[PDB]
């Protein structure tokens, strides 16, 4: 134990953590790996998502070289503050924090070679802009851009470990989402010239497909059961004017209320979604049904044969014209 | 210039004691306070509080900070506030108080050759203000902002204002939808307690509510519903279901409308001026339905009364609501 | 004058080890505590918690801070509180709390020639207040505030309340006002608890409260009472107006249904019925019964018009009375 | 005496390197851990998480902390915890957490002559509780709390539960109450996991819960069951009252739609049906069927008045039984 | 060599007083500022505020940092930023803000031989954006971002934009992220303001926005337009169908009432009507008029069946035209 205390003091004695390793001589290469402990709740309304990861970085620091009986140096966060570490920052980060209980969740391991292994646990909320045209049969891709803030590529460079495959791992238990399937992950790296230098930002893309089950129960079934209800009016006689009216007047507003209700939970986007269109025609079908009764009742006294006919015909054309719409609707957006 | 000032500061901090107030055992330090309100944030009658953004300032004399030099003032940043003595000023009715740390601690420290110190910091405060919203939405309130020393009673520390006691900023930036800033007054006093007799300093802000929102959100839909219920008078009793819908649905909406109105408001036990408006409107609507039931119970047997009731309702029901509206508005309008 | 106090402080802190409690190995440090509630924070029924803004004072004696000087006390800032030893008092039932910090930390340190220390601070604390809501909205609740040392059992540190003069618990008239509850009163207590890490002395401050019924009278009871009375107006119509009679019942039963769910959403998700729940239940029975009354009358109006018509005439007097008597017994039961 | 303890502390910390765990290169640091749940925090189904307030204790041996003195143990504050080495234990499934700090950090350090350390602290932790809601609201859910070291694999640090005389996991009787769940019990566990940075030993604390049906019986089931019977009241009316019969069906069919969406808005947006959803689904079928019954009856009332009238009489007894038969099987199925 | 830079840093910071601005007593510290909006954060109409994620850069010259070495610029971390003097810039209209901290504080310090300092940082800022919603939802809003020093007036520190006004503020094309607004453009400005604590130079960056009408077309306008059309279907029924005609009127008037409250709940509780309110207001008039029309015809249907029939056949052409013309005038106006 006493031997290692002197090793640490010898490495940190006269060690300036304010300067990156290789300043003015070599670029600091940082191989990075990532393990997603859990994929956090995705907020469509806020166009963001949360993620809890173990973010590891390894670089070579010659000032930390040493010869001893051990092969490395398992240490705590205590030493991480005393040495130099990369100033990595997540570009598209909204709000994030490093877990601190029981102690700062950090790990420092130093090798005789001088290579440093520096991993930490982070929960990050980042922006994930979405296009919701195909909602709720939609797929989304959420990025995670990160890189150095003060050191361009001429001084610090990032690269993925093990190659672009298996560089990023995700715990199967932690990718829990109520509304999305986590299809897969793809990594990337690109240099970008900025007015403060050309930095190398590395990205981790998370592709997602939305689950239709929830909206089937909350929106689609309530709408489909309301359109068929409006069509029951056709099976009544024009003599029951009030009854026929109650059917139409109520089902059109039920359809209106379902629209506003179904949209309140979604982001206030200024364009229609696949759910909106479905609701739109369902409103047309119910409104058409009520308009059908208004027509028969207006001509039932002058053209009772035509008015009566139009009732018998509506009992078959409306369901087919709606049933055929669902066939094309669900086939188009699920293809 | 730079080197000179550096030595003036180092020579004033070598034998200095941050943990000790000036005029300790000698006299009571006088603190001339001033305040500039940047904005008046949202009022939250639910938790009986309100937000406020201010530049708060304290100016005391510290003997230990006397320096002889050619320069007049030492315009410095916040890095010196922790290395000199600072009053323990705290706010007696604040639910939470926050400072501003971007880009730097939003504080300034100015020192004169005389030993006078100017220390002002940006603050945002959530002060508690109990609201007697009985005349709501036609209610008038005044809300305080008390602050005194936490540990130096009257003998050790004392406060007083300037003639620039308070200074308000651009009122358009202020996010006060339902209220309008009108008044601002200051008060000094000494409250007695067990730990001592502290001199407390309060600044009241006076706010008068606006009806515009509630007029469109509540009063109008209430005024139109009673009217709709009275259109039922211009129908025959043959169409019983028709006039039954009129009454049943209107009492239904005046009910939902009341709950929708109170949901967004604090859960006060007493009744407000609006609750009364909503209550009597419900009566105007409910009274219209029972009128039809009475007329219906008479139509079949005795069409004498069943006919003249509607004739008089079409005059009284509308005219009795309008007189009530004049009574209601004029009572609170002035 | 000023230089004298600077040297006094330096002499006291010179060689002072704040890692050790005063009297370690000789005497147990007794901590007399007083409390002043600056404001009783909003009570959250849904979260079963309450907030409170207090001035929490602790006084003990430190043999190492004995000094002789001109003035008898030492008015100091919070800066010294960190340099000396202070008790590690913690609130057992605390959920989340914080110490006020503006303009400076709301704390005060006063040291006497004797060595006695006075250490008071301003704290806003949200603590758990488990509630039994059987009598809701006519319920009374008692919210505790347990606190004590975390690392020092009774063998090392002990807490005690102050004498009567310095009231153990005080509550500012400015702060206790609550929109939904009355703060009846407060009672203190002290008790030892044997734990696997020692026997600690926890001190408790209980705050008893009864809910204000005004809000629910306006939001739930009146809508329910007026909806049952509305349903009974159906009796004043003829059976010939079948649709009309139906509109009364069908609408009022759902009006009562909606009033339930609406009244049911805002309250804590407790899995047992409250006094309000039963009230809503009976109003639903009376409204549903009224609609069922017409369905029976309309079913026998063709075969027994004399019986069908007469029961409509009695339903007008049995329903209101039977409901009026229900309200009389209901409101009398839960008010006493 | 006080000066004696000052020298003891200085002797232990003199030349003490807290950057190195005890036994580096000599022995693996074994950390026996105990836990006491001061309160089991609110469970958030929508957020799939739960809160918990625990006293988390760890005990290990540090040779460098060997001292010889009059007192056997050393009751200390958090000040010494920062100066010595402590395990870097972390909760894997943590969402957001914090250690209570008022008035001082809620921490306790006790050192015995042997060198054994007792290190316990108070923690409020929000952790993930993945839930399966197929049997909702009659389901059982288990919330884990897996924890272990972050930088020291099993080859350097090992965790183990308290073998005897202390139940490894304790739950305060005062804190365990929950508005929506019963806390059935707790089960502990230990497991090695091979990772690219070593094989760590994570220790698990499972908290098993079964949901309380009381809230949903009144909020969803009764409103649904009372709405289905309402739709069946239509059978007691004449076919001539088409509008009346229509008002019944259209109104109850939409009421059932509203109850569905309403009951699901408060729940997590899961993409699968629950036992409540199915219950609502069939209840929608029964009401829609009732309206469908009148639509059929009303269509043949002129051509087959004997059949139309006849089916109205059997529908009055088959529908209630056919719904009552569903409830018998439904409630028996999920409640056994 | 690394050791060479270690001595350079120590020599510069040795005896360095960060409490004093560079050029104190000789020259005013000029601070050239640049800004890059990494993303334009959500705008909260209810709160009259907006969020923004920027890289905020400031550059000034400090003679005390003049150094001679191998590399002519010094790429450094935040560690040194606290040890030297930096401007105390603060955003006046700031509500609440913070500097990103992961993995390390998002800050950058670069020093040159000349002594020029480059100090940039990443900030997420929530600031006040006072709005006038008369033309809501067809409105344009401008959100400011005033910033400047807190303790140094123009006599001590002065701010200026880089490379003139042009290109001083940039916005990432990926970062222009608003669901409800278009980010038209940005314009900068500078102005001196005399205050009781000195004459400071505040620099402002205005962000102009035009609201997107798509969301409200689906949530408010179409429900309103289709509900008025629904009410007019009543004209195509006979007065004999009193209950039916009543059901139309009774239902559409309350539907329109409900839509107002619904549409109004999401908006700020402003005490004045918006373009949406008026649109809803007339749609309520159109539906209520239709119900009143039936009440009139049904009142005279027996006495003047020719006139009662005439007003029905007339409502079928006058109501749609008067509403269609209103939308033509309404939508054409804005
Ligand atoms: C014919 C015209 C009828 C008049 C218009 C009717 C207006 C009332 C519609 C209510 O619909 C609900 O509104 C909630 C609040 O907007 C939504 O809550 C959901 O979404 C909200 C916003 O994202 C969240 O605050 C909630 O927690 C979440 O449950 C919910 O999904 C939606 O069904
Ligand atoms: C037939 C019997 C009666 C049945 C009644 C059923 C319907 C109840 C009416 C609901 O009305 C809404 O309630 C919200 C609360 O639920 C309010 O939200 C407002 O106030 C809330 C609480 O202050 C905030 O959370 C919201 O953000 C804010 O929009 C909103 O203004 C109000 O219009
Ligand atoms: C179909 C039936 C719909 C009933 C709607 O009734 C409303 O539901 C809200 C559901 O949110 C309640 O909100 C109240 O209670 C909620 C539950 O805590 C809070 O979130 C709200 O802010 C508060 O206004 C509100 O009182 C209640 O009238
Ligand atoms: C007939 C055709 C039209 C379909 C029906 C339209 C009306 C929709 C019913 C709304 O019912 C309410 O929805 C809230 C959410 O929107 C729920 O709030 C609950 O759940 C929310 C989200 O979980 C929380 O934010 C609230 O605080 C909590 O009270 C609340 O329980 C529920 O009664
Ligand atoms: C004529 C008969 C009587 C009618 C009385 C009113 C009936 C009920 C209307 C409720 O309308 C909803 O209210 C929500 C709560 O106020 C709004 O939520 C929206 O706005 C709220 C406040 O900004 C947010 O809290 C929510 O998350 C957001 O979804 C929502 O948009 C709105 O459609
Ligand atoms: C994958 C990567 C190198 C970026 O990860 C770490 O470097 C890291 N950092 C911390 N930990 C890890 C390892 C690696 C595999 C996942 N993993 C863990 O989950 C874990 C565990 Br089970 C217990 C204690 C520490 C860690
Ligand atoms: C007069 C008073 C003591 C109440 O003054 C402050 O409290 C204060 N403290 C800081 N600042 C101010 C002055 C006051 C007038 C407006 N005003 C400012 O807004 C401001 C500005 Br523009 C830039 C830099 C500092 C300040
Ligand atoms: C009673 C106790 C020792 C527990 O006292 C405090 O803890 C305390 N701490 C600070 N202050 C107080 C006293 C106590 C009585 C009311 N009271 C105050 O409210 C107050 C006031 Br008005 C101004 C300045 C300081 C205080
Ligand atoms: C059980 C366990 C070892 C895991 O617990 C602690 O080690 C611990 N840590 C702190 N405290 C305790 C004891 C143990 C029993 C519960 N218990 C307490 O509740 C308590 C009390 Br009443 C007052 C002061 C400190 C504590
Ligand atoms: C434009 C301005 C001077 C106000 O900006 C900076 O001074 C700054 N500050 C930090 N960074 C930058 C550059 C400039 C362009 C945007 N930009 C970046 O996004 C970026 C990146 Br990709 C990686 C590392 C650092 C930065
Ligand atoms: C970006 O810079 C790195 C480091 O010089 C280099 O390896 C890489 O090839 C460059 N571009 C791309 C597209 O990889
Ligand atoms: C400062 O000025 C006062 C008054 O002239 C004088 O008494 C004192 O000696 C001066 N101090 C110094 C350091 O010059
Ligand atoms: C209060 O404010 C007024 C107006 O500025 C001022 O004249 C008066 O002196 C102030 N009084 C106190 C006690 O501050
Ligand atoms: C608490 O401890 C003291 C000292 O041992 C004892 O006198 C007192 O009776 C104890 N109180 C309880 C409730 O056990
Ligand atoms: C983990 O590894 C250690 C060392 O081999 C062993 O003693 C222990 O039994 C293992 N635990 C499990 C759960 O496999």
Residue numbers in the entry:
A (entry chain D): 15 to 322, 430 to 456
B (entry chain B): 23 to 330, 438 to 463
C (entry chain A), D (entry chain E): 14 to 322, 430 to 456
E (entry chain C): 14 to 322, 430 to 454
What do the study's own words say?
α5 subunit-containing γ-aminobutyric acid type A (GABAA) receptors represent a promising drug target for neurological and neuropsychiatric disorders. γ-Aminobutyric acid type A (GABAA) receptors belong to the pentameric ligand-gated ion channel superfamily (pLGIC), and in response to the neurotransmitter GABA open an intrinsic ion channel that permits the passage of chloride ions and drives inhibitory neurotransmission in the mammalian central nervous system. In contrast, clinical modulators such as benzodiazepines that treat anxiety, muscle spasm, epilepsy and insomnia bind at the extracellular interface between the α-subunit principal face and the γ-subunit complementary face (between α1/2/3/5 and γ2) and do not induce obvious conformational changes to the pocket in structures solved so far. Instead, here we performed rational engineering to generate high-yielding, high-stability, simplified homomeric and heteromeric constructs based around the α5 subunit that could be structurally resolved by X-ray crystallography or cryo-EM.
To solve the structure of an α5-γ2 site with higher affinity we co-assembled four engineered α5 subunits with one subunit containing a complete γ2 ECD. We crystallized this construct, α5V2, in complex with another type II BZD, the partial PAM, bretazenil, and solved its structure to 2.5 Å resolution. Bretazenil is an analog of flumazenil and retained the same binding mode at all five pockets, which closely resembled the α1β2γ2 pocket (RMSD peptide Cα backbone homomeric and heteromeric sites versus α1β2γ2: 0.73 Å and 0.72 Å, respectively). Inclusion of the γ2 ECD did successfully recover a higher apparent affinity site (the four lower-affinity sites were also still present), which had only 2-fold, 5-fold and 15-fold lower affinity for 3H-flunitrazepam, 3H-flumazenil and bretazenil, respectively, compared with wild-type receptors. Of note, bretazenil also possesses an additional five-member ring conjugated to the diazepine moiety, but is nonselective. This can be explained by additional compensatory interactions that the bretazenil oxytrimethyl group forms with S209.
